[PDB]
Design a protein around this ligand. Sequence first.
Ligand SMILES: COC(=O)[C@@]12OC[C@]34[C@H]([C@@H](O)[C@@H]1O)[C@@]1(C)CC(=O)C(O)=C(C)[C@@H]1C[C@H]3OC(=O)[C@H](OC(=O)/C=C(\C)C(C)C)[C@@H]24
Ligand SMILES: [Cl-]
Ligand SMILES: [Cl-]
Ligand SMILES: [K+]
Ligand SMILES: [Mg+2]
Ligand SMILES: [Mg+2]
Ligand SMILES: [Mg+2]
Ligand SMILES: [Mg+2]
Ligand SMILES: [Mg+2]
Ligand SMILES: [Mg+2]
Ligand SMILES: [Mg+2]
Ligand SMILES: [Mg+2]
Ligand SMILES: [Mg+2]
Ligand SMILES: [Mg+2]
Ligand SMILES: [Mg+2]
Ligand SMILES: [Mg+2]
Ligand SMILES: [Mg+2]
Ligand SMILES: [Mg+2]
Ligand SMILES: [Mg+2]
Ligand SMILES: [Mg+2]
Ligand SMILES: [Mg+2]
Ligand SMILES: [Mg+2]
Ligand SMILES: [Mg+2]
Ligand SMILES: [Mg+2]
Ligand SMILES: [Mg+2]
Ligand SMILES: [Mg+2]
Ligand code: NA
Ligand code: NA
Ligand code: NA
Ligand code: NA
Ligand code: NA
Ligand code: NA
Ligand code: NA
Ligand code: NA
Ligand code: NA
Ligand code: NA
Ligand code: NA
Ligand code: NA
Ligand code: NA
Ligand code: NA
Ligand code: NA
Ligand code: NA
Ligand code: NA
Ligand code: NA
Ligand SMILES: [Sr+2]
Ligand SMILES: [Sr+2]
Ligand SMILES: [Sr+2]
Ligand SMILES: [Sr+2]
Ligand SMILES: [Sr+2]
Ligand SMILES: [Sr+2]
Ligand SMILES: [Sr+2]
Ligand SMILES: [Sr+2]
Ligand SMILES: [Sr+2]
Ligand SMILES: [Sr+2]
Ligand SMILES: [Sr+2]
Ligand SMILES: [Sr+2]
Ligand SMILES: [Sr+2]
Ligand SMILES: [Sr+2]
Ligand SMILES: [Sr+2]
Ligand SMILES: [Sr+2]
Ligand SMILES: [Sr+2]
Ligand SMILES: [Sr+2]
Ligand SMILES: [Sr+2]
Ligand SMILES: [Sr+2]
Ligand SMILES: [Sr+2]
Ligand SMILES: [Sr+2]
Ligand SMILES: [Sr+2]
Ligand SMILES: [Sr+2]
Ligand SMILES: [Sr+2]
Ligand SMILES: [Sr+2]
Ligand SMILES: [Sr+2]
Ligand SMILES: [Sr+2]
Ligand SMILES: [Sr+2]
Ligand SMILES: [Sr+2]
Ligand SMILES: [Sr+2]
Ligand SMILES: [Sr+2]
Ligand SMILES: [Sr+2]
Lengths: 337, 132, 53
Amino acid sequence: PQPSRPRKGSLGFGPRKRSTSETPRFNSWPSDDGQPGVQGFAGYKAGMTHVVLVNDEPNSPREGMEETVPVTVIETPPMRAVALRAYEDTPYGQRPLTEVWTDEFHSELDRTLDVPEDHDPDAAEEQIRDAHEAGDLGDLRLITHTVPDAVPSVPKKKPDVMETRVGGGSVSDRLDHALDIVEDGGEHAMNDIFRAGEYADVAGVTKGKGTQGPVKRWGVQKRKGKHARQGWRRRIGNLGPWNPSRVRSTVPQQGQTGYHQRTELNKRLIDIGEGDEPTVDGGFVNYGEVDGPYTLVKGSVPGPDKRLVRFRPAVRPNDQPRLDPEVRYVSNESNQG
Amino acid sequence: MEALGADVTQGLEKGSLITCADNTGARELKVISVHGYSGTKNRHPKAGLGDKITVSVTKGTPEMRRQVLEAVVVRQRKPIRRPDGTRVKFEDNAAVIVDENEDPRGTELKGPIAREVAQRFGSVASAATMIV
Amino acid sequence: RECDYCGTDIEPGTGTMFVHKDGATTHFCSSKCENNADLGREARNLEWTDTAR
RNA sequence: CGUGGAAGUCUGUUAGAGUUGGUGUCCUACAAUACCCUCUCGUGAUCUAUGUGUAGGGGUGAAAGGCCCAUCGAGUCCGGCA
RNA sequence: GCGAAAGCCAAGGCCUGUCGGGAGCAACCAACGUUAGGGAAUUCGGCAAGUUAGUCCCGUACCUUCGGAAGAAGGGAUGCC
RNA sequence: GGUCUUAAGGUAGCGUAGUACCUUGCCGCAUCAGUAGCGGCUUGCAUGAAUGGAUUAACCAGAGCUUCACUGUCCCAACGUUGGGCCCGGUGAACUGUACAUUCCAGUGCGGAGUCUGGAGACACCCAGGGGGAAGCGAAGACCCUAUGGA
RNA sequence: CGAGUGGCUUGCUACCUCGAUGUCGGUUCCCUCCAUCCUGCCCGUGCAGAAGCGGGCAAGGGUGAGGUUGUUCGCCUAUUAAAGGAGGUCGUGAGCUGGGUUUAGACCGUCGUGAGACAGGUCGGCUGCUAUCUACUGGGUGUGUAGGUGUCUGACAAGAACGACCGUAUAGUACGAGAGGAACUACGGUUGGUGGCCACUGGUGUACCGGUUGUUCGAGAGAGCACGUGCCGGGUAGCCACGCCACACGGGGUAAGAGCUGAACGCAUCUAAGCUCGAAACCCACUUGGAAAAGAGACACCGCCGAGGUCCCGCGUACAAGACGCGGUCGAUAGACUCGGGGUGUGCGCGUCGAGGUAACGAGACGUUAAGCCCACGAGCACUAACAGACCAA
Ligand SMILES: COC(=O)[C@@]12OC[C@]34[C@H]([C@@H](O)[C@@H]1O)[C@@]1(C)CC(=O)C(O)=C(C)[C@@H]1C[C@H]3OC(=O)[C@H](OC(=O)/C=C(\C)C(C)C)[C@@H]24
Ligand SMILES: [Cl-]
Ligand SMILES: [Cl-]
Ligand SMILES: [K+]
Ligand SMILES: [Mg+2]
Ligand SMILES: [Mg+2]
Ligand SMILES: [Mg+2]
Ligand SMILES: [Mg+2]
Ligand SMILES: [Mg+2]
Ligand SMILES: [Mg+2]
Ligand SMILES: [Mg+2]
Ligand SMILES: [Mg+2]
Ligand SMILES: [Mg+2]
Ligand SMILES: [Mg+2]
Ligand SMILES: [Mg+2]
Ligand SMILES: [Mg+2]
Ligand SMILES: [Mg+2]
Ligand SMILES: [Mg+2]
Ligand SMILES: [Mg+2]
Ligand SMILES: [Mg+2]
Ligand SMILES: [Mg+2]
Ligand SMILES: [Mg+2]
Ligand SMILES: [Mg+2]
Ligand SMILES: [Mg+2]
Ligand SMILES: [Mg+2]
Ligand SMILES: [Mg+2]
Ligand code: NA
Ligand code: NA
Ligand code: NA
Ligand code: NA
Ligand code: NA
Ligand code: NA
Ligand code: NA
Ligand code: NA
Ligand code: NA
Ligand code: NA
Ligand code: NA
Ligand code: NA
Ligand code: NA
Ligand code: NA
Ligand code: NA
Ligand code: NA
Ligand code: NA
Ligand code: NA
Ligand SMILES: [Sr+2]
Ligand SMILES: [Sr+2]
Ligand SMILES: [Sr+2]
Ligand SMILES: [Sr+2]
Ligand SMILES: [Sr+2]
Ligand SMILES: [Sr+2]
Ligand SMILES: [Sr+2]
Ligand SMILES: [Sr+2]
Ligand SMILES: [Sr+2]
Ligand SMILES: [Sr+2]
Ligand SMILES: [Sr+2]
Ligand SMILES: [Sr+2]
Ligand SMILES: [Sr+2]
Ligand SMILES: [Sr+2]
Ligand SMILES: [Sr+2]
Ligand SMILES: [Sr+2]
Ligand SMILES: [Sr+2]
Ligand SMILES: [Sr+2]
Ligand SMILES: [Sr+2]
Ligand SMILES: [Sr+2]
Ligand SMILES: [Sr+2]
Ligand SMILES: [Sr+2]
Ligand SMILES: [Sr+2]
Ligand SMILES: [Sr+2]
Ligand SMILES: [Sr+2]
Ligand SMILES: [Sr+2]
Ligand SMILES: [Sr+2]
Ligand SMILES: [Sr+2]
Ligand SMILES: [Sr+2]
Ligand SMILES: [Sr+2]
Ligand SMILES: [Sr+2]
Ligand SMILES: [Sr+2]
Ligand SMILES: [Sr+2]
């Protein structure tokens, strides 16, 4: 009666087309709980190494023992929160009201933006406060950029601009917290937002694989046995039945693979540090040497080396945080060999 | 079942001819099924280290031959991964015949066993000469 | 640990452990050493190994 | 034990003849029967060139209604014929 | 080398099995190499592929029309100086 | 049944057969499981003696089955190689074409509609793709019936 | 016995197609139905418990591997939570297969005087086409909204992004004479699916290094050919799976169902008004797309004689064209060089030894030599090349 089988690939990451922004854009943000803070950071993918760890999990029979865990090294230098955008609750959803900028800008920010010369931070701040009094204020987010110049292995000097939310206390107290970060110079580090041992969500634009067939793209079978020698090797059986007399968008077809935005959930931050502790002998292949602020993410992270990855506190964690894991050993062995 | 404390890459399939690491009279075992396993379309049902499998006696004594008995996969050629990242592989693929209560059918076990199999099946452990 | 073949220090979280028929255990640092052992070559006879020099 | 060297004898892409499978390639072809690999025979009822004979309800046929100039359960041409 | 066999190379012939240039050169296709562990589970069917292989020594069953079966099978050897 | 048709009334053998409807016959071998294969039984729908029966060593690009060995046939797919494929110069066909034509879901209609009806959707053009539909293209269906047709 | 629903079986009819709508089975890939096999929530019991039997809501997900047979069907085995059924031209041959049916060859049985036949069996016996339209998967160019850079919004759109099982504690506990034997909950793992990634294991690696057979360049050295590496051994980067990482809970509203308050009907009544609960199902949550959403969007800054963009040049985190991204001397973008990091496995030559041999000669051994050769990665380094310069634009 022909065996049942789940369909080839998922329909939830559709359409499988090229990403608009190489800079990932979060579609969801964490809940407002504790003290006001920026709900995310960003860095550049470096490569991989392994780390030996002491089991933190209280429910594991191996609690206290040495365990080898794979890790993705990401260079995370300080970022600059250059502005504060405010949204207002309109009957058509959330719309941007005004932005509060600065005077202090990074030397090479003019490679992406038409940097402000004449702005009134006080009139903008006043507009946001009248909206708060009116009860029309939505959420408060910061316009943030990265400093790729701080990373020697990344060729680009052109900053990657992205918006990040500020959640936490009351809308009055976090407006103030946001303005204080901006009005200084906008400088903040990974430490300011994340603590080692917490679960983060990493968003990234995947490795570009160009155009690939159904077998690679959707995981369909190759033609088996005798069918494999007739002139058809990696082409599906049919594009659909007689009726409906059309090809459904659900049938596995050829096209763009990779260079899509993915948001990898519940990624444990093994260690946040600075220096050259995670650097590989001979340098990370197709990247370079690490000597500065870094993060160690448990397992894999979307995108290739040199790509901008984004961080966010886990919106849906399964486990309770087990802060600052005991790092007994970090490998520095050559990735070549 | 209880966690092995090792990641196994199933080295056996349904129909695989393996060794019988005991004194039961059974020399060669043929895998028929894997306990608690349900595959997917076109996939050959896979068996690995630490799995309780159903077997048929291919080679051996006349009384043992053709019998459909249960067994435990003790050794396998394909590598398994220990928590410290090290891979562990064996010289052969072997299994020990077990009964309804998971007690070995024989008395003496031939060749080495993996420590994770020993942790899962205790009466097979306290019968094992070498535990690697 | 140290490699039961060449004699270099096996980087933790790397390597394979081969269990022989009798029960003997051989820790290998790489695939190169495993493959040289399968060729019936003895570590002492090869110049690149730490066992020889 | 040696000698002898028989054979519709054996192995063989010797030359040469043949054409089992791939239901591969081709299938507006290189080709109106092709290409490649695989396979069979290869001192004999063998293969082959040239010359010569048998002609259409007739030849020829180790017989498949096979073949008789891409034409065969009765060739081709023209005529009967509009 | 057993060889009018393969492979390589002379003499002789040719670059006319007669359109070129570019893209680490994607999908897909034709020919093909290598694939861990398992080993026919594939399929109407081992189709396709693969395994074996030359030479010498040892050794060789049932059956038989006594010719044969038979290179049965199985085991060992093989370079250079 | 314990002769009757129409002369005789199946002997040796072989037998569920390339012949056996029933049928995957029953028993056994083998497999975890065998409409297969082999042995035995065998009342044989409808075996059988030059319409030759039986048997058989040797031979076979003949049909079926089993074992050892081997392996990407499969689990389950990967990477690579050569020629294409894609872009550029040059050369340069053919198939096919009532018309209109951006369709989709339902309905209706000679009961199997891009074109009718109602809705839904739909900015134009171009590149690559695998072929769902045009009851796609190719051949005045060999099947079937019919013709006071042919051979 | 009576009343029906379906259109899966079979039959009937002869409406449609004979200037052809390609067969059965299978396969591959997609959507759906519910009359539900499992999974969730329930009611009854001849419901102690455990395991069941019957029923209700429910189509989210799952429903698998194999032996005979062309088989569909079915029989059989071992697993399983369960291994449900059905529609899509008995879905699917401009997708595959060609085993069966159903040409031409042949045999057997039966029938026939015979040619020859058989709704008997058997061996053999072919699979065309360069996509015009439409359809969808992906990629571009323009126009509309009406100068630019950057950041967003969210009408709508997709999702299974998750499904299921085993084990431990609960517990040898509740229940039961005993035999036997649960649950809530909390944990650990597995399986299927999904997305991504390559530190580790594994594969490849006709980059590279080594060994070695034949032959040719006289030997040596060093090379060519042996199908696109002669063969064997090792194998970096990259790409990969056989490797590794991630994939809730919770809210809201309901179905079946359990109830509350409550009348018609003084009582009673879960319902008629009202209300508290309650499914793996629905909605939100989460992931992906999405200013062409014609109400064609918002914000901030820059600019209208100049903001910005294009061409050009050096290159990839990108790539079939196009597109995308980065750098361009105020520079490390690419190459050379030198290190570092890696592959292989110890170079040529010379010296000692070497079974022997009068000597000639000599396979090989040792040393020099972690040697020699090589690198798709990294760093240092402006030496070389990113020069010169063109165009559009409110
Ligand atoms: C290209 O072929 C066709 O279009 C046919 O359509 C389906 C079909 C036919 C016909 O409709 C038609 O001629 C049936 C559907 C007609 C029918 O009535 C019937 O009973 C059957 C058994 C047909 C199946 C199929 O049959 C073919 O032979 C028949 O196929 C042929 O007749 C011939 C083919 C493929 C070529 C040799 C010309 C089919
Ligand atoms: Cl297939
Ligand atoms: Cl099974
Ligand atoms: K017809
Ligand atoms: Mg590596
Ligand atoms: Mg290594
Ligand atoms: Mg199948
Ligand atoms: Mg003649
Ligand atoms: Mg005939
Ligand atoms: Mg293999
Ligand atoms: Mg073959
Ligand atoms: Mg029989
Ligand atoms: Mg007679
Ligand atoms: Mg006709
Ligand atoms: Mg006829
Ligand atoms: Mg006539
Ligand atoms: Mg058609
Ligand atoms: Mg119902
Ligand atoms: Mg559904
Ligand atoms: Mg099968
Ligand atoms: Mg059909
Ligand atoms: Mg079709
Ligand atoms: Mg066809
Ligand atoms: Mg075609
Ligand atoms: Mg057949
Ligand atoms: Mg046939
Ligand atoms: Na083909
Ligand atoms: Na069809
Ligand atoms: Na004689
Ligand atoms: Na041929
Ligand atoms: Na004639
Ligand atoms: Na007779
Ligand atoms: Na012959
Ligand atoms: Na292959
Ligand atoms: Na089509
Ligand atoms: Na009805
Ligand atoms: Na009908
Ligand atoms: Na079919
Ligand atoms: Na369902
Ligand atoms: Na079956
Ligand atoms: Na049809
Ligand atoms: Na078919
Ligand atoms: Na076909
Ligand atoms: Na609810
Ligand atoms: Sr964002
Ligand atoms: Sr969104
Ligand atoms: Sr074919
Ligand atoms: Sr239609
Ligand atoms: Sr054929
Ligand atoms: Sr050709
Ligand atoms: Sr042809
Ligand atoms: Sr072939
Ligand atoms: Sr011969
Ligand atoms: Sr002869
Ligand atoms: Sr005439
Ligand atoms: Sr010459
Ligand atoms: Sr020419
Ligand atoms: Sr190799
Ligand atoms: Sr088989
Ligand atoms: Sr031999
Ligand atoms: Sr008789
Ligand atoms: Sr209309
Ligand atoms: Sr095409
Ligand atoms: Sr149920
Ligand atoms: Sr089979
Ligand atoms: Sr049927
Ligand atoms: Sr039947
Ligand atoms: Sr179907
Ligand atoms: Sr056929
Ligand atoms: Sr039949
Ligand atoms: Sr018939
Ligand atoms: Sr217009
Ligand atoms: Sr329990
Ligand atoms: Sr008990
Ligand atoms: Sr070559
Ligand atoms: Sr109710
Ligand atoms: Sr617009």
